[PDB]
């Protein structure tokens, strides 16, 4: 299991860091109470839009804003969540080791 | 039972000044679309058209007022108001 | 038996505007053959045609109705009307 | 309690001289909304607005008074007050 975990853990850690694969993943759960400009009484096209900025429209029509604010977000919350994997795996190799110096019956 | 009707339009010159009327039986206004601005008396409007048109409305008539200064011909074109789509009017500019 | 005719051509200056009319016994406009504009009231126009041309049309005369503003020698051109083809009118600006 | 108006604004042409009033029953200036100037007498302006612009303010009247000097069509802007916000005062430039 340690090399079986050291596999994975740095392509988790890195992709996490680099935020792009989170924001492409998780851009269409963004909130919209926060900002008055996506009302939309339709409610659907503000989906349709939401999870359209983040990929490749462009189209400055000075919403861009709004997108430039939950991008960082995104980007903010990924970073941090991948610190917060690399420390639970770290705790959890830690423990782990710990665990099998103390259940190990052998000297 | 909403219903969305514009008025004040026509045809002004260069330079001119132009005052759009939506009656009302958030707004936001577009032009042909093409997104121009919004209001709530929080006003926010497109760089393409910033500094040149003022939005202010009073419930008191139920009815939103686009203040346009300085109009072009450039921005010739038929404008509508989105709170359902509004009818519209046509702006020519010579 | 369903037959479409084209009207309102003709000769018109620089800046001027014209009505093109076609009357029918979804719907799309060509000149000559480059696409034009589309209704279907969700209203669609070409960019080398944008912020020029206005299309409507109504049920109760079974005619579609193509406003334009603005015209120049350089779109100088017949043009059709496709739902079939439409026989197309000669329009000329000097 | 506390309201603030907004006076002396208008059309002026191209090389004049305006005179802004805000009534108060540290004072900031916005255009549209932009950044304009600050008083406390020590001054603060913009560079996009540096030496066109003076504010002074006197405390017997209870106002604020900003000289504009030179003003262009450029700068044709609505102009408010912050403290709470004033009202604003339309100010084109023909």
Same mark, same amino acid.
């Given at each position: 299991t340690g090399r079986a975990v050291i596999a994975p853990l740095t392509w988790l850690a890195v992709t996490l860091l680099t935020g792009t694969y989170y924001e492409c993943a998780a851009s269409?759960?963004? /909130?919209?109470?926060?900002?008055?400009?996506?009302?939309?009484? /339709?409610? /659907?096209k503000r989906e349709e839009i939401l999870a359209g900025f983040?990929?490749?429209? /462009?189209?400055?029509?000075?919403?861009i804003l709004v997108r430039d604010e939950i991008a960082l977000l995104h980007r903010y919350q990924s970073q941090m969540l991948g610190w917060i994997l690399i420390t639970l795996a770290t705790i959890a190799a830690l423990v782990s080791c710990c665990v099998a110096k103390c259940c190990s019956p052998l000297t | 039972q909403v219903q969305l009707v514009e008025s004040g339009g026509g045809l002004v010159q260069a330079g001119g000044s132009l005052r759009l009327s939506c009656a009302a039986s958030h707004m936001r206004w577009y032009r042909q679309r093409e997104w121009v601005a919004a209001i709530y008396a929080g006003t926010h409007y497109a760089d393409s058209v910033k500094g040149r048109f003022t939005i202010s409305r009073d419930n008191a008539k139920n009815t939103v007022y686009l203040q346009m200064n300085?109009?072009?011909?450039?921005?010739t074109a038929v404008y509508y108001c989105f709170v359902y789509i509004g009818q519209g009017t046509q702006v020519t500019v010579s």
């Amino acid at each position: 299991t340690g090399r079986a975990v050291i596999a994975p853990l740095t392509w988790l850690a890195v992709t996490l860091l680099t935020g792009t694969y989170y924001e492409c993943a998780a851009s269409e759960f963004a /909130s919209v109470d926060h900002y008055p400009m996506f009302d939309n009484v /339709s409610a /659907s096209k503000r989906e349709e839009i939401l999870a359209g900025f983040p990929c490749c429209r /462009s189209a400055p029509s000075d919403v861009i804003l709004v997108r430039d604010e939950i991008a960082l977000l995104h980007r903010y919350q990924s970073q941090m969540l991948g610190w917060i994997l690399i420390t639970l795996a770290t705790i959890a190799a830690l423990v782990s080791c710990c665990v099998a110096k103390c259940c190990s019956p052998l000297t | 039972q909403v219903q969305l009707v514009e008025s004040g339009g026509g045809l002004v010159q260069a330079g001119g000044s132009l005052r759009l009327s939506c009656a009302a039986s958030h707004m936001r206004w577009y032009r042909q679309r093409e997104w121009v601005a919004a209001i709530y008396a929080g006003t926010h409007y497109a760089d393409s058209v910033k500094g040149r048109f003022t939005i202010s409305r009073d419930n008191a008539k139920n009815t939103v007022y686009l203040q346009m200064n300085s109009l072009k011909p450039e921005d010739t074109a038929v404008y509508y108001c989105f709170v359902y789509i509004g009818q519209g009017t046509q702006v020519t500019v010579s």
